Design a protein around this ligand. Structure first.
Ligand SMILES: [Zn+2]
Ligand SMILES: [Zn+2]
Ligand SMILES: [Zn+2]
Ligand SMILES: [Zn+2]
Lengths: 426, 426
């Protein structure tokens, strides 16, 4: 009765504030916070936190000397001094369990704007969905965690333990934002990141390596092409080589504890290609930006050695590459895989919070995408939960988030905070 | 003999003026007259022609309504109103045969500047060679044609017939600059273009078609790669299809009366590639700029239909393309092949000039590259000769011209003009 009344009041608070929440998310989605362009979104979030009475700490990857940590990933052409993190702290003298709530506010490129059916940064709301780049992955989740805490406040309460609310860059490229919050000093008894898991807990997740191949060739006139080579055709040779390696890796994936019975869990992608200068000249250069997954039994340095070996073996079978060996650039992720070890108390609390919010059991799922919980649990021994709202089209056209999923997910997170941290009268 | 005397005075004249010729050529090479950026080079040439007493006509592709000609080729992103031609005319009441001397002053992109051993637009001279983009192809030949006429003047003569000296853009991409000189009204009893043929007459030359393939595909999270498709992988499928088609075309090439015994005379090249947005997103787009040659019995229209069919056939067999057909864009050349039929009087005169200058018989060769002689002969019935100096590396790193060759070729052209046009004493 005591317990049901507090729950029914948080539910009330979440509904009361929900119209504001959707507006809040729309504003976020309208920030085109692609890589390198996140500062305005973070400035806004900082002021939003200030408005709610949090102590606010904003700092860059350079402020914590990011490259000094062995798990920091290389930053390619992006200046670490411009890559901004925001951590809001509600301090407390309470006896409950402290919590980190974290989400990323970087979003992946929208792609060809003409292929979206509603514009990617307008945040059009339609038939109970909001369409936008970042709406699902993961600004929706970010709105859910902030408003979970607003709901507790609206209901007349405050968490009975220290809480940090973290908004980070670089999740989609390195993970260095998440890592920097830990380098900066922030700890808690648990961490929850509301990636768009469709109301599931991510039980295990792959890691990943980003790498760029820079290929040369011997340019000649097309008329004399046999006397030269093409860097673009040689790049294609390497793509085929990496595809074969990836098939070999997936044949071995059956030995993995968690992903053993999943079909082709290791994914290889050539995401960006550029090369050549002239339709009637042999291409002298070609660059490929790639990604390769790794499983729970692998480390990134093992996967990097494997990548180097695959490339070394493939250079020998191409004439242009025997005279012009391709350069390998570590261009981003060197990311650990992670497991949410079953049987933890944090998961028990989320199970009960989920039950109350969705009137269903909490399902666990595998993920062939990376997420930032890995830093919290692998590197800092913090129980970490990846769990969030439902939507469609991450990294795709017409990415969209289910607004009723979001309401329920916001409630679930609020209920989680209440049990995990405990409540006190505001 | 009297003809031997005139030849010796022309030999002396070319030698006297050669240091000036080299400085003139260096200045030309120092103009980075890549496509769209040729106007300063043309403004300088116009003035150099005015300084020599020629009547000078400069006009753009727009000024002749280029697109109105059936042999005009598409201009892609390049504004015809800014593509400048220069035609210098030396009128005569003489009874000799009139002559066009023509060269292109557009140069192909230099490619990775760090892979040149001497910078591409510095025109360094070392060990009897000049290194530079355009030095061989074909600013060298332009200097030769200009200084051949300067030698005739130095020796105390003028050509005894009308001469037009033409410098044009667009040879490396469409041929529209050459065609515009003819649409403007310029005619003569013969035309000579000093492409760097290594002191050979080009007997026959391929045509060519430029085309761009614009792919789509369905972008997803690499994590769910199989859910979607890669536009990059689909572009590769098309490249393979065009390579197979080119193979079939070369199988049929045995029936060409000029190229029938050449191995692989038809060349396919993918010169430029761009695609995708993100290492961890499936590529939604990919664009390829290509070139395909065609042989002397083929027409550009027929080649174009063949390219369209090859593409149509290949769309069927790719998943992403089966639902997202790639678009073909005509991107430049729609260039006729050409033949310099043997037995012509112009060739006889060139043969004599060549023997006098080089003490060697004139060899004739086949070319697997297009040149602008096609318009003069095919479209306007003007006997046209492609013949010029020796170098190395057209469209390649460290393009260079042999200065001893340049000097002798300049004499050869002077001797050709003297006999073709006749000479009168100043
Ligand atoms: Zn995410
Ligand atoms: Zn993502
Ligand atoms: Zn040329
Ligand atoms: Zn050329």
């Amino acid at each position: 009765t005591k317990s049901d009344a507090i729950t029914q009041s948080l539910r009330a608070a979440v509904d009361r504030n929900f119209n504001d929440q959707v507006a809040f998310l729309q504003r976020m989605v309208q920030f085109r916070s692609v890589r390198g362009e996140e500062a305005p979104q973070q400035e806004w979030l900082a002021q939003q936190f200030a408005d709610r009475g949090y102590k606010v700490d904003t700092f860059s990857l350079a402020d914590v000397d990011i490259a000094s940590h062995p798990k920091a990933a290389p930053m390619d052409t992006i200046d670490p001094a411009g890559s901004m993190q925001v951590v809001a702290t509600a301090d407390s003298d309470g006896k409950g369990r402290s919590l980190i709530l974290q989400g990323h506010i970087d979003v992946v490129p929208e792609g060809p704007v003409d292929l979206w059916s509603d514009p990617p940064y307008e945040a059009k709301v339609r038939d109970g969905w909001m369409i936008g780049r970042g709406a699902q992955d993961m600004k929706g989740g970010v709105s859910a965690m902030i408003f979970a805490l607003d709901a507790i406040r609206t209901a007349g309460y405050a968490p009975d333990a220290r809480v940090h609310v973290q908004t980070v860059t670089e999740e989609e490229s390195t993970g260095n934002g998440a890592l920097s919050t830990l380098m900066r000093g922030y700890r808690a008894d648990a961490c929850l990141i509301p990636e768009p898991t469709g109301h599931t807990l991510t039980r295990a997740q792959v890691g990943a390596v980003w790498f760029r191949l820079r290929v040369r060739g011997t340019p000649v006139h097309v008329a004399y092409s046999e006397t030269g080579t093409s860097a673009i055709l040689s790049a294609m040779h390497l793509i085929r080589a990496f595809e074969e390696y990836t098939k070999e890796l997936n044949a071995q994936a059956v030995r993995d504890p968690w992903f053993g019975q999943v079909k082709n869990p290791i994914k290889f992608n050539v995401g960006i290609i550029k090369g050549g200068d002239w339709a009637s000249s042999t291409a002298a250069w070609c660059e490929l930006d790639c990604r390769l997954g790794l499983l729970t039994g692998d480390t990134p340095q093992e996967a990097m050695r494997g990548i180097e070996k695959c490339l070394a073996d493939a250079q020998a079978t191409d004439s242009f590459l025997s005279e012009n060996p391709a350069e390998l650039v570590w261009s981003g992720f060197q990311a650990d895989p992670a497991v949410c070890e079953p049987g933890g108390v944090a998961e028990d609390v989320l199970t009960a919070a989920h039950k109350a919010a969705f009137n269903a059991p909490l399902d666990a799922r595998l993920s062939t995408a990376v997420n930032d919980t890995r830093y919290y649990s692998v590197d800092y021994g913090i129980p970490a939960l990846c769990y969030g709202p439902y939507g469609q089209g991450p990294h795709a056209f017409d990415e969209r988030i289910d607004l009723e999923s979001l309401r329920k997910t916001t409630l679930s997170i609020a209920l989680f905070v209440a049990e995990w941290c405990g409540l006190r009268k505001l």
